[PDB]
Paper text:
All of the [name] LBDs fold into a three-layered sandwich comprising mainly α-helices, as also observed in the nuclear receptor LBDs.
The structures of the [name]δ LBD in complex with an α/δ-selective ligand, TIPP-401, and with a related δ-­specific ligand, TIPP-204, were also determined. TIPP-401 (α/δ dual agonist), (S)-2-{3-[(2-­fluoro-4-trifluoro­methylbenzoylamino)methyl]-4-methoxy­benzyl}butyric acid, and TIPP-204 (δ-specific agonist), (S)-2-{4-butoxy-3-[(2-fluoro-4-trifluoromethylbenzoylamino)methyl]benzyl}butyric acid, have a trifluoromethyl (CF3) group at the para position of the tail benzene instead of the adamantane in TIPP-703 and an additional fluorine at the ortho position. The only difference between TIPP-401 and TIPP-204 is the length of the carbon chain on the central benzene ring. TIPP-401 has a methyl group, while TIPP-204 has an n-butoxy chain. In contrast to TIPP-703, the dual selectivity of TIPP-401 and the [name]δ-specific affinity of TIPP-204 are attributed to the chain lengths of the alkoxy groups at the centre of the ligand molecules. In the second binding cavity, the three amino acids of [name]δ, Val334, Leu339 and Ile364, are replaced by larger amino acids, Met325, Met330 and Met355, and thus a smaller second binding cavity exists in [name]α than in [name]δ. In contrast, the EC50 value of TIPP-204 with an n-butoxy group for [name]α was 250 nM, which is about 25 times higher than that of TIPP-401.
Author numbering:
A (entry chain B): 205 to 239, 243 to 264, 271 to 475
B (entry chain A): 211 to 263, 271 to 476
Write the structure that this text describes.
Amino acid sequence: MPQVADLKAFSKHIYNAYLKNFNMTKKKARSILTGHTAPFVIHDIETLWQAEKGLVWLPPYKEISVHVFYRCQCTTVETVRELTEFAKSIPSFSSLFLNDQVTLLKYGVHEAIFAMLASIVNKDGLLVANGSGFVTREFLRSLRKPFSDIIEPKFEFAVKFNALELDDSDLALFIAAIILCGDRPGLMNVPRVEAIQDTILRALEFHLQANHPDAQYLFPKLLQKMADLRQLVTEHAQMMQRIKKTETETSLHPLLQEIYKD
Amino acid sequence: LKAFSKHIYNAYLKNFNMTKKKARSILTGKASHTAPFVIHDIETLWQAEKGLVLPPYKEISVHVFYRCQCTTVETVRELTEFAKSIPSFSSLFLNDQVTLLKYGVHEAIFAMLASIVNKDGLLVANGSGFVTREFLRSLRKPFSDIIEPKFEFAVKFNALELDDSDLALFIAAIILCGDRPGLMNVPRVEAIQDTILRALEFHLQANHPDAQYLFPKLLQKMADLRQLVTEHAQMMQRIKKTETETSLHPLLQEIYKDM
Ligand SMILES: CCCCOc1ccc(C[C@H](CC)C(=O)O)cc1CNC(=O)c1ccc(C(F)(F)F)cc1F
Ligand SMILES: CCCCOc1ccc(C[C@H](CC)C(=O)O)cc1CNC(=O)c1ccc(C(F)(F)F)cc1F
Ligand SMILES: CCCCCCCO[C@@H]1O[C@H](CO)[C@@H](O)[C@H](O)[C@H]1O
Ligand SMILES: CCCCCCCO[C@@H]1O[C@H](CO)[C@@H](O)[C@H](O)[C@H]1O
């Protein structure tokens, strides 16, 4: 099959773009949470302040809850870069005019960020600083209200998502499909993207068949997860607008600013 | 430091197909290539279109207007590859790479036009033909109004006699201009811009020894270039506002918007 041909490869390429650009994979991550060092479990002020100073590891320290909030922003900023590189590592993506690539990453980065978060997280916590730390959900659950409410949803979806058992090759394609989404606000060359999206999804469709043989309704579930990811980022942007209103004191990083404006 | 000037010169040479080099030679009636077929009426332009040298052909003046667009579309394409070809530039987050390109391209397109023009006409289609300023003016006012201001600038700029090496450094100083509206990270840009300008200067003393007052002149041409585009946009908007029948490429739409 002429299609099945250029696709298995197109799949591999993206997978080779994922592996070259993300500092953390579910492969590496999953090992840490199961089978070197025992990541310093952060669960309170001491562990936090400890991990901070030098044990494990930025705006003027104001408070633990705001400090964590900031530590969640940096994460996003560093991820958006790897996601630009990953996007660029797709020849049909790079061809697009610079402005179209911005609109994609702008409205796409968080959908992709909430899917990759699931990789470095288990029902009890997430991996920080190249998996050398482990922030406990219980600690994160105890942060100040305004900021403690954005942390939970991310967890609820991460577990319901991680049950599909997707490895790094599925995610390579999954993330590409999230970035190249024609239905993006103010996109220009829409048909070109919609077209690039179909190749990715078809490649993703073939790939799930080989990689997850006797599996079930996996593909349609991921399209749903993609839809759930659209809604999660929405429920998120909303909480962020309230943080910029009520938390008159806490700051927002430049890149997170321009991402939310309109 | 020259590692910067060599880097930008090789970024400029590799990226833009028509350097002042090839172009300037092809106008000095030289021998290493071939004669350029002149275009002055509708018969020559059609011939060019035929073989010797895109929306539904509406009219004379509009067909040219369209050719102007598809020309700045491939210039913006080489200009993007160029800008990225400056490592210090690429580091920047995609969003700012665009803002610099959104307000810089036209300033940089008009400077390079002068590179391929002269009081009589300009080279079109890879120096394969030669459109005349005469034929250019003759087009209906809602089009001839944008073409001439560029010719006046063109000649009143080639009088400085730069060479590809300078331009490489001129176009870079225009692209990276932290005075662009909505730049997320102004300081990181104002820093790169300074390096290029300092780099430029050192290169102008060596490359244009006797050039009395060169470097300060260019910065002035830089300002004039913002002046030209600013006025160029005004007209374009006015056309988009009048010639409803006339289609404007989506990319030229995004650039102008808000200007
Ligand atoms: C895995 C589920 C956890 C939810 O994680 C989230 C949720 C929302 C966001 C939103 C960010 C900024 C608030 C964004 O909107 O871009 C970031 C993280 C990512 N946060 C971190 O990576 C993180 C990083 C450092 C710390 C620590 F150690 F400082 F406590 C705690 C953290 F949750
Ligand atoms: C060098 C001085 C000439 C002035 O050229 C100009 C002036 C303004 C613009 C503005 C363009 C679109 C209107 C833009 O704003 O991006 C483009 C050109 C570029 N035009 C062309 O490249 C061009 C291309 C083809 C033809 C023709 F006659 F052969 F069809 C005529 C042309 F001026
Ligand atoms: C790779 C990360 C990219 C993050 C991009 C964030 C883009 O924000 C948008 O940048 C545009 C210019 O490019 C502006 O015109 C929009 O008003 C602004 O909302
Ligand atoms: C390399 C050529 C780049 C041309 C870029 C033209 C960009 O236009 C701007 O694109 C932004 C999204 O990216 C929008 O948010 C702004 O409203 C719009 O004005």
